[PDB]
């Protein structure tokens, strides 16, 4: 559960992402695919090569979903229900995977926003991502 401070931190940092959103999203996926190769299993029909346009496109989708979550922070389940359906009901993604992507996103943010990635913001971002993961792995409809 996020503190008001958490929400503020998240809005501030995610805000600084801006139009890089998608790039950051694609980099996080590539980091995931290389570091934890088992995750590729969920993308049987993707071109997971290095400058893959498929991954770039997907990265943008992921990044947009996070922007959506930020702009509905106080009522995530309602805003992300379609994503829960996909991830939880249709794909049946093992929750462990969410920890891997969350980690890869944190790594990406650290590598790009050195001044913003303070311990306090790192803490809020981790908590936020765990919140999002919980929604996407639950069947609540």
């Amino acid at each position: 559960v996020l503190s008001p401070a958490d929400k503020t931190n998240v809005k501030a940092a995610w805000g600084k992402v801006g139009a890089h959103a998608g790039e950051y999203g694609a980099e996080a996926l590539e980091r995931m695919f290389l570091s934890f190769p088992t995750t590729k299993t969920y993308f049987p029909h993707f071109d997971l090569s290095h400058g893959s346009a498929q991954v770039k496109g997907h990265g943008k989708k992921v990044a947009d979903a996070l922007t959506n979550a930020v702009a509905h922070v106080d009522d995530m389940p309602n805003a992300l229900s379609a994503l829960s359906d996909l991830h939880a009901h249709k794909l049946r993604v093992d929750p462990v995977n969410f920890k891997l992507l969350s980690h890869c996103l944190l790594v990406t943010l650290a590598a790009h926003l050195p001044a913003e990635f303070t311990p306090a913001v790192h803490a809020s971002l981790d908590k936020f991502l765990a919140s999002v993961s919980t929604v996407l792995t639950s069947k609540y409809r």
């Binding site: 290389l34 934890f36 980690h103 590598a111 790009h112 050195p114 303070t118 311990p119 790192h122």
Partner: protein
């Protein structure tokens, strides 16, 4: 853990550029801030009341050095991590009873710290190599639990 020659090179090269006096404290400090239940193990360290307090604690910075020293030890003996961490496993498992998931968290925060420090140089393939190392270390520390 087995790193291809290419991976070991990449790991090795970056590690020589790590500020050994500071990176360990940053990593320990962030563990304490990000996963606050871990503070319960460092009560004798003093004031861990605020992120600011954690990060400026002399004991956290000093202890951080010791932790980093352990990682350097692993890097030099990827071959026998288990042998290498035997005494540390006993300390952490049977004397401190630290849940093993905590070992993985520290390994991941170190990775975050490296990324923060090196920027673009901490590439996806470099990270991949570092993940195998960090998992190997955590697995060696958790040995007594296995």
């Amino acid at each position: 853990v087995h790193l291809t020659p290419e991976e070991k090179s990449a790991v090795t090269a970056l590690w020589g550029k790590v500020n050994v006096d500071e990176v360990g404290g940053e990593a320990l400090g962030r563990l304490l801030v990000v996963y606050p239940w871990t503070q319960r193990f460092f009560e004798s360290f003093g004031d861990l009341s605020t992120p600011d307090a954690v990060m400026g604690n002399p004991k956290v910075k000093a202890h951080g050095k010791k932790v980093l020293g352990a990682f350097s030890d692993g890097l030099a003996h990827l071959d026998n991590l288990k042998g290498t961490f035997a005494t540390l496993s006993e300390l952490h498992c049977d004397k401190l009873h630290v849940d093993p998931e905590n070992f993985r968290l520290l390994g991941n925060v170190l990775v975050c710290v490296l990324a923060h420090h090196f920027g673009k140089e901490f590439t996806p393939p470099v990270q991949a190599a570092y993940q195998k190392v960090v998992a190997g270390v955590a697995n060696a520390l958790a040995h007594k639990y296995h």
